Amino acid sequence: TIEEQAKTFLDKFNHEAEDLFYQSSLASWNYNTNITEENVQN
């Protein structure tokens, strides 16, 4: 019971975490590609 809902919580968390981490990594890569204050803010 508790294991099932924990697994469901993890599955729900996985996609959102993947998307947000992809966005953050893309922002970091952009800041490491060029150097602008706008990239720092992003």
Residue 40's alpha-carbon distances to 8, 14, 26, 28, in angstroms, are 36, 27, 13, 9
Cβ neighbours of residue 33 closer than 8 Å, sequence gap 6 or more: none
Way it was determined: cryo-EM
Report d(CA 16, CA 3) in Å as an integer.
Answer: 21
What tokens appear for 29 in the block?
Answer: 């890569």
- DSSP symbols for the chain: -HHHHHHHHHHHHHHHHHHHHHHHHHHHHHHHHS--HHHHH-
